[model samples]
Target: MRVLITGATGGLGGAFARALKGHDLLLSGRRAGALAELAREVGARALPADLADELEAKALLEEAGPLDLLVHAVGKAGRASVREDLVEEMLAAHLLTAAFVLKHARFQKGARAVFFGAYPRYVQVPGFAAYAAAKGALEAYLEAARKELLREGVHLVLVRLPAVATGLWAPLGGPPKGALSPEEAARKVLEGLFPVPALLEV
Candidate 1:
């Protein structure tokens, strides 16, 4: 199957990029050189894109088009920054980016996009307010999108990854109770992609 992953240079993304090898792939991220290198290593298409720019996102999608699966592995990162800054980043990366990518994917047949979510959204936590809020929004959007796009053969998978030591979640501190490694987190994400069901809660 063809798999398109956003933030392909990241810990989770990179791990997945390697694990999901042998399939036709498209990997997008802010780091062009690194992505290109990875693309060479994995035989996947590589493209650079900032999560906030619709144009860049559009281009990436156009390249990744006619896809079977999409893993929205991008995010604004941790709660280390001020609320306003973090929220702004969160909205742009986690929300706005997702919207545009989904729009690009709308016309694709057999397309299914998997968005990165957080366990923090469901439970209470300290200093995760902004991050959790964004995840919460993601869940809501996916739920609605799933219903709306069901007839189109496009599946929506939400992978609410638990606290992973990925640098993005590192600064925010460890997982609430049991933190998994980035590799483990990526495995959970892959499990969510199985064709058995249309969605995986975590």
Candidate 2:
């Protein structure tokens, strides 16, 4: 299968790259240095671009040609008050990026697109208002898009994930005590793809 894994420089993304080594892969991320390194390690092509930008995301999909699977792991982590005006930034990172990619990507028949979603309970906590709102909007967007894409045999999945032990938690001191490792989380994400559930929690 032709797989495109965005945020390929990050822990969960990198773990997916390693786990999907035998497949035809195109890895993308903002960090060119780390992306190049991982591409070499995994023997996959690297296309480094900031997915939040419409043009970059479009160019990436064009260069990738057609994809059988799109693993959108791009995300950001931060703590900001709801009044801090960080909602736009969060939305761009977590929402617009997915929108841009989906809008521009060429999907083969029976293609699967997997997006990372936050656990609802955790995102509703204090200090996470902006992030929570962005995720909430993303879920709604995907839900609607899923119905439309199903007509074309494209399965859109939103995976509501638990906290994984990745650098994404560095801002919050570290991952929680029971956080899953990146490898474990990556495995679950792959397993969910086979049956193509509309929503998955892990």
Candidate 3:
């Protein structure tokens, strides 16, 4: 089966690539060099895309053609300033990109898409207000997208994860604990993508 994964250069994407290496795959991200290097190591085709750019996102689906599976694994965990660049980045990166990809690929044969989601507990964590808000919005959008595409035989999976040992967290000068390895996380996510009658969790 053909699969397309975004943000495959690091964290869950890298682990998913390592875990799901047996399939014909396309890995996409903004970093051309990193994407190419990952393609070589993981045995997937490279299609570097920056989800932040609306035009680039459109080109991604056009270039990839119809795919059996797509995963929008790209995201950021930091809080966005109200109506600031951070908010723009959060909306564009996580919400808009997922929406755009589904707009094109939701009806493709055997198509299933999974997007990374997060808990909004940050609101209580103090000072992470905007980040929590974005996640809440993101999850809502995913739910609605699932309904919109339900009749088309497309499966929408939302993997709402807790804190994981990812680059975003690490860069905040924190390390991850009980964080699922990229491989483990990949397995659970891919398994959820089966065209079954269940919503995603874990």
Candidate 4:
């Protein structure tokens, strides 16, 4: 199957790339060096871009061809007392990127779309306001979009995740308590790709 994985330079996305190493995969990320290196190591095609840009996202779809699976693993981490500007950044990184990917990507007959959701309580904690808001909006938007996608024979799957040891949290030091390894999370993500469900809370 032809698969496209966004943010493939990050821990979790890289793990997913490793997990799908033998498959026909197109690994995408913002980092040129890391993305090209990983693609070489994994024997997958490298397609790097910042999904935050509408043109890049559309170009990603155009280059991706008809994809059987698309794993959207790109996102920005949050900070306590996030500034107004950063909040917009969060929205663009998470919500708008998602919207662009969904809007422009061409799906195979049974194409599966995968998106990771945050922990239920991540937003309740202080400092996660912007991250939570963006995730919340993405979830709601996907909920609505999935219906039409289903009608078109496209499957959308949402995975609610526990804190996993990814670069998203590295700036804050390291993974939080109960965080899963990127490999473990990626394995589970693979399981969710097929037999697509509207929601899979982990």
**CA RMSD, predictions in order:** 5.1, 5.0, 5.1, 5.1
In Å, residue 187's CA in model 1 sits off its true spot by 2.2
Write the residue-wise lDDT of candidate 1 on 47-90 in tens digits. Answer: 88886788878887776658888888888656542434777777
Model 1, C-alpha of 132: deviation from truth (Å): 1.3
lDDT of residue 34 for candidate 3: 86
- Tell me the tens digit of each residue's lDDT in model 4 across 90-133: 89988888899889888888889998777767665678887888
Which digits, one per residue and each the tens of the lDDT, describe model 3 over residues 100-195? 776655237556778877765534355565566666777898887776666777777778766567686764566456766667767777676544
For model 1, the stretches where C-alpha displacement exceeds 4 angstroms are: 80-84, 106-108, 120-124, 173-178, 195-202
Question: Which 10 consecutive residues of model 2 have the lowest summed lDDT?
Answer: 77-86
Provide the global lDDT of candidate 2 against the true structure.
0.91
The lDDT ranking, best first, is 2, 4, 1, 3
The 0-to-1 C-alpha lDDT of every candidate, in the order given, reads 0.77, 0.91, 0.74, 0.87
Native-referenced Cα lDDT, model 1? 0.77
Which residue pairs clash within candidate 4?
none
lDDT of 4: 0.87
Query: How high is the lDDT of residue 177 in model 2?
Result: 89
Model 4 stretches astray by more than 4 angstroms = 82-84, 194-202
**Candidate 3: segments with Cα more than 4 A from true spot:** 79-84, 122-124, 193-202
Ranking 3 against 4 by TM-score, winner? 4
Which scores greater on TM-score, model 2 or model 3?
Answer: 2
Candidate 2 lDDT over residue span 139-196, tens digit each: 9999999888998899999998888999888887889889999999999888877534
Q: What is the lDDT of residue 126 in candidate 4?
A: 75
